[PDB]
Each structure stands twice: as C-alpha cells, then as structure tokens.
C-alpha cells in the first residue's frame, strides 16, 4: 500500500517537473511487472533518475484508458513541463510530450520483459532532460526476437486484468508514495 490517492491532479505551472503516470491497477491489484520487478522499486528508480536531474517527480494514477500511450497523454496534459512517463502494471513504458499525437512519443520501451531497474532509472533521467530541453541521447534500445514468444500471452493477460480498472470520464488522481 505504498500508493495513496491524494486528490484529482491539477496542471503544473512551471517547467520544473515530470509526471509519472501509472495504470489504474499499478501497485494495487498488480504489484510487480511482467518479469516480477516490484512496482515499488520501479517507481523508486524512476523517481530517482528524475530527481537526480534536478527535476520534480509527480505521480498520478490514470483511469480513462489502460493503454500506455493514453496513460502518458493523461500525464502530459498535467505536466507543467509538458513531459510525462506512462507505465503499465506489466511494465511497459513510454516517454511522452504535450503536443505529440497519442501514438507518437519521445522514447518507447515496447518490450517490458527486457527492462531492468537500471533502465527505469535511465528513463526518469532522460524524461528530466527532456523537461530541461536538453536533447538527451535515447536510452539504448533493447530488443529480442523471443520476447513475444515467451511473454506476449502473459502480457495480454496482465493487460486484460489491469484494464478491468479503467473508468471512463474519471480524472487522474495524484498519488502519495510511501
């Protein structure tokens, strides 16, 4: 229970933060990603890479879609810096930006099983750089032709389960982290 909903998030007013937007079942019905990394550790590394760069990390839970693009979009809307990080419970991550089409992004991590706690901290790091307007070099690509054979059905199932917590029309809740 390291996540407390503290109220409907409001838009940021300065380019001094990055929003981390998580799925409606993040740290709740699901508590690890597809390869067992705890959600607790994931948020901690993302938050550290951000803070690492002299930028604030703000966390919200999104409800209107469990799609990671749209989760991120919900975050970039509110991000005072316009930059957001969307994360599904299964671990899939995206760095998004106020202004881009929902299915466009700054950086995408479309193979969750290959992500480590290190990747996660690098991702926050770069989101902060984007927020600062530096043009960071992309977090290096992770690819593996067997990730789908090994994990795509499990991915499908973890997404079906998180998707049951979607609430149409419900605004994002800012999150208190333990």
């Amino acid at each position: 229970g390291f996540l407390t909903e503290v109220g409907e998030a409001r838009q940021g007013t300065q380019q001094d933060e990055v929003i981390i937007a998580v799925g409606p079942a993040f740290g709740l019905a699901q508590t690890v990603n597809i390869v067992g990394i705890p959600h607790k550790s994931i948020l901690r590394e993302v938050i550290a890479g951000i803070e690492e760069e002299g930028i604030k990390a703000r966390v919200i839970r999104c409800f209107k879609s469990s799609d990671v693009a749209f989760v991120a979009v919900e975050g970039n809307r509110l991000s005072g810096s316009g930059i957001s990080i969307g994360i599904q419970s299964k671990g899939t991550t995206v760095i998004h930006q106020q202004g881009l089409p929902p299915l466009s992004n700054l950086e995408l991590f479309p193979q969750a099983p290959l992500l480590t706690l290190e990747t996660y901290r690098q991702i926050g790091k770069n989101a902060a750089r984007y927020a600062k307007r530096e043009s960071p070099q992309p977090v290096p690509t992770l690819n593996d032709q067997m990730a789908r054979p090994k994990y795509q059905a499990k991915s499908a199932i973890l997404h079906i389960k998180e998707t049951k917590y979607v609430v149409t029309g419900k605004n994002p809740q800012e999150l208190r982290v333990a």
């Binding site: 879609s65 469990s66 799609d67 693009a69 749209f70 089409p101 929902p102 299915l103 466009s104 479309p110 193979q111 992309p138 690509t141 690819n143 593996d144 032709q145 067997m146 990730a147 789908r148 054979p149 090994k150 994990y151 795509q152 059905a153 499990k154 991915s155 499908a156 199932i157 997404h159 079906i160 998180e162 998707t163």
Partner: protein, 551 residues
Amino acid sequence: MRSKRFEALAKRPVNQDGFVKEWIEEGFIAMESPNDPKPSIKIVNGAVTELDGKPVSDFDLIDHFIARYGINLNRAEEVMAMDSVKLANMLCDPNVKRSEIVPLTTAMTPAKIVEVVSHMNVVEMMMAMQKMRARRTPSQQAHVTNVKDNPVQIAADAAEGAWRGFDEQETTVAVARYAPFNAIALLVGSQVGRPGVLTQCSLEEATELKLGMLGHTCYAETISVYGTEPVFTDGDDTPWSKGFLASSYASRGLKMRFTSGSGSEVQMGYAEGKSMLYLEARCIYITKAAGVQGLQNGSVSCIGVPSAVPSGIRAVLAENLICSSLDLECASSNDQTFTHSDMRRTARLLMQFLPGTDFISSGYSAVPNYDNMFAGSNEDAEDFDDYNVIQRDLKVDGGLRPVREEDVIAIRNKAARALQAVFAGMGLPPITDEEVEAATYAHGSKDMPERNIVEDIKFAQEIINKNRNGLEVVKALAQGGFTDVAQDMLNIQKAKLTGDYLHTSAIIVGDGQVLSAVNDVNDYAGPATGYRLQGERWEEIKNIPGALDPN
C-alpha cells in the same frame, strides 16, 4: 528420481513458448467459441435492423460500418438461408469457380462466413485458399530494417531482397526521426535490385501519410483496424477515420491495404467475450466496407495470442481464407515470431506457403532477426536456403529463388553506391567508400561502421520540414552518375499517376507491367489448372547451391 526422458524433453525450445488454457469469458480462444453470435440478418426498407443477433439499437460504430457498407444487402437474405456446410464444401471444391463463390461470400455476414470456414480442416482450407486467392500469381513481402537505422545497409539489404524475389519490401525505424532516410534507402535499393518492387515505411498514421505525400514511399500497409469498439478507440481511430485515410492515400495515387490480425483485441484488453476469429472477421468486413483493396492479416504481430490456445494456427489460416474469400488481397503474415522451435514455425508457415497467397509472408525478414525492428519475423535471412530447398522439394513456388553470391555482392554494391551518390547529391551526411564496402559484404548491422546519428537525423528531419520530395532523389541519381537508377525511380513515381496499381493485389513486374487481380485473374479449376510452377521458373527454383552434376 527424474525421468531422463522428460528431462531431455523439458530442455526442448518448444517448451519456452507461451501456452495458455482457453479463457472463454475473455475471448482468449482462437475460434469456435460458444459466445460467438449465431449468424443472422434482418433488413427493413434496405437497411439492416439486426446483425448476427444484435439489434440496430445496440450497434457500435463497427456494426454500423459493416451493416451499411460491408455486406451485399441485395443477396444477404438468400445467402444466410444457404447451408454453411454446403458453402464450405463449395470453397474447397475445385469445380466451383471462385467467380461463383465471391457473389455469395460478399453477401455473408461476418458470423456467417466464420461459421462456414469453421466447418473446415486445414487441408480443406488450403485447397480453398489456392482457389480464392485474388492474384493468380503468388508473391512475397520482406522486412528490411536494422538496429542502427543505417541507410547504407538498408539499401543493400533491399537490393538483395528484390534480387531474391520480394515484390514488396517494408522498413520501419529504431529511431523515429530517421524515417525519411530509411524510406529513401529502401526505395533506392529496391529499385536497384529489381525495378518495380514496392516499398513502404511503417510509422505513426499521420506521419506515414505525410511521408507518402512527399514521394518517398510506394504504398502503406500498417493502416490498422480493430474488431471491437473500445480496442479501435485505444488504437486512436474509428472505421470512418480509417476509411477516410484509405481514400486519402488513393487521392495521392498510392496503393494501400489495412492491417489487422487475430488476437489484437485480446492483447489490448477488450474482446467482448468473442473468439479471435470472429473479431477478426469484423476487421475483414471493416476493410471491405471501407473499399480498401487488401489486408495484412493472419494474426500478424499478435501471433503469440492465438498460438497460445488450441487451433490458433488453424484459425490463422482461417482468417486468411476469409480475407481472400471476401475478394480482398491477402498479405498473409508469416512475419512475426511466436515460437522458439523451427519445427513449429515451419508448420505455421506451410499453411500459406503450400497453397500460395497474394503475399505468402507479409514480412519475411530479409535481415537476420537481430536486425528486425518488428521484434522478429517467423522467417529470416538465415532461412533463405531452407526456404529454397523446400520450394524445390515440393515443387511449390514460394515467390523466392536461389541466387549467386557474386550477383548479390554486385547488386548490394551498386545499391550502396547509388545511395552514396544520392546523399552526396542531396547534401546529406556523407556515405563513405568504407561504408559502401561494408554494406556490400554485410550480414547485418554488426558488420557496419557506426554512423553519426545526430547529423543523420538533423538532415532526415529537414527533408520533412523543408518538404524535400521524391524528385530530389531522382535528380541526385541522374546527376550523380546513376541515370538507369534515376529512370527506374521516376518510373515508379509515374505509377502513382495512372491508378493502375491501386487495384486488388497489384504488384509491378517485368518492365513496369502492373500485375493485379484484374489482369492476373486466378482461374483455378483443379489439377493441371490455374497457376502452376513450371518452365523457366521451375528451372530457376530447382537450381539450389550444393546440387552437383551426378556425372
């Protein structure tokens, strides 16, 4: 004590694949689900009041699109009343002409034609598919990608693939902003390999359309549709936006197809309790209704979803058969990894390979799978010889051929050199002779010098922001010592003016000769009829490396 037998088995690669027990309430069942709707249609004053159980009052956007534009209402009542078993028999009967069947199938509802093909085993489906395939001649499509978005390597890999037989080639980007370079490299190398090969660069929808408008692609394929309303919505489209997109590509004289595939609605969280096959049929009818000529399907990137459950690979063949039966071009997947086992992936591919489809694969990887930016294909460049041998063993035209190393080296080299001149001529970050050489002899990006990515992407982006169009590539080639190649490039740009290759299954062969289902009519009537591997093409297929003269 453990059985040594079971311990060996446990080690087999197939046991690393994901398998799941069927989950019917969530649509995690490939076909024949008890939740699928019984076929039905009611029509009053020329408008559908009920479709496959559902009253018009509950229609979602997909139901509406399909009921209004997807079905021949003039004969739907007649065909609904026909026996689905008889109709499936007609499909595989060699003596029932494709032209007698399409007037019926295009009058079926989605649930009706699913009920029909579900009566069939894969042998019957294959017997049917060789007949229902729209183009008489089967073809093939390859992926040309690499981990580095190296343009040199893309042009060389593209010319090799064109030389080996691919009539369509598809690239995409590891780094989004590289897109214009990949597209131009793919187009140039393809033309060097065989003039007429069509190219696409799969991107974000708006981005890809803009790129086509600039002249750097020949067609678009990954124009997605989805089989439930919530999933379509998360896919950021509706049938009307995608139907408008289709017409937008045609208004610029560009060929396009939609993409779909069993298992996508499961993967994206809303199957609405329906089987994959049935939801895929809705996608096939969204394609028909939009007036799109063709479709990439057969699970495509979600192949891990049907493959995990019983009869999923049968289901994959079934959705390709429904596509062809509904008189659409079928680019039949076989482009995405779902297994660690060679035996298993081979069984999956033969379903389309043996009967032949418009594109047996919609993305054979023409690079080693480490360089495949669609996260791996079902076949890759290291399978080229096996594919050729199986063609020769079975006397089956798989659309590819054996090739000589010296020929491939020269073609790759010429493609690298042509692109060198393009880059020099257009003021892009140079391509060095060293780079030309590596691309020549490369297997993949592991063999290529690292490029200055920042410089590339800044010039790639200026192509887009300054609208540097396709004729700039033509000119650079002409002025840079590559008149032949410049002419071939201009010739493929000219195809965009006539609308000829917009038709069902169009490819471009020989000397700029369009070949589609309109002029290359499938006329299967059983043994010794229809397309047959024979003559010079058979000789070409038989000449594998390693076959020495017995004398």
